[PDB]
Amino acid sequence: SMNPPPPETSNPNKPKRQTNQLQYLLRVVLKTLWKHQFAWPFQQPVDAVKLNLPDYYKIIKTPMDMGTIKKRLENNYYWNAQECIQDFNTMFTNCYIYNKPGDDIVLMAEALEKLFLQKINELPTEE
Ligand SMILES: Cc1c(NCc2ccccc2-c2ccccc2)cnn(C)c1=O
């Protein structure tokens, strides 16, 4: 069994910025979700070998996880907040597409998404 390489977290030729909106996405949004009791399944890429999910990467073609998002925020990978917000939404959507309603992993994603939506609702205006 085989995992794909993780998503890119470093690219010297990709343009990037340090902005108050991206600082908020690390300091408020990522920090809030990361410390949550249901964060652990989302803190690293889905390991299809260890989890015995040989079909995972047949169904999910844009993998994303909070470990990758945390690295992208800490290593200033992003140009804007929308790029980072899309990564969170990709992570949640992948969970809902692969799994079934009421599955433990879906209940965990739903709890994290509720907090995500609450925090993004108060995304500050650009300075
Ligand atoms: C389908 C799927 C996963 N499957 C396993 C799982 C399921 C529920 C809770 C926890 C884990 C887990 C987490 C880490 C290690 C071992 C099991 C796990 N994560 N995601 C995002 C999934 O979609």
DSSP, residue by residue, 57-95 = HHH-SS---HHHHHHHHHTT--SSHHHHHHHHHHHHHHH
Query: Whose C-alpha lies nearest to ligand 1, atom 15?
Result: 41
Residue 9 lies in a domain: no
Residue 2 lies in a domain: no
Distance between CA atoms of 111 and 81, rounded to whole angstroms? 22
Resolution (A): 1.4
Domain that holds residue 84: 19-123
47 contacts 3 by C-beta, under 8 angstroms: yes
CA 92–ligand 1 middle distance (angstroms): 13
Whether the CB of 39 sits within 6 Å of ligand 1? no
Residue 3 lies in a domain: no
> Domain total for the chain?
1
Residue 54 lies in a domain: yes
The coordinates were experimentally obtained by X-ray
Whether the CB of 66 sits within 6 Å of ligand 1? no
Residue 4 lies in a domain: no
Residue 11 lies in a domain: no
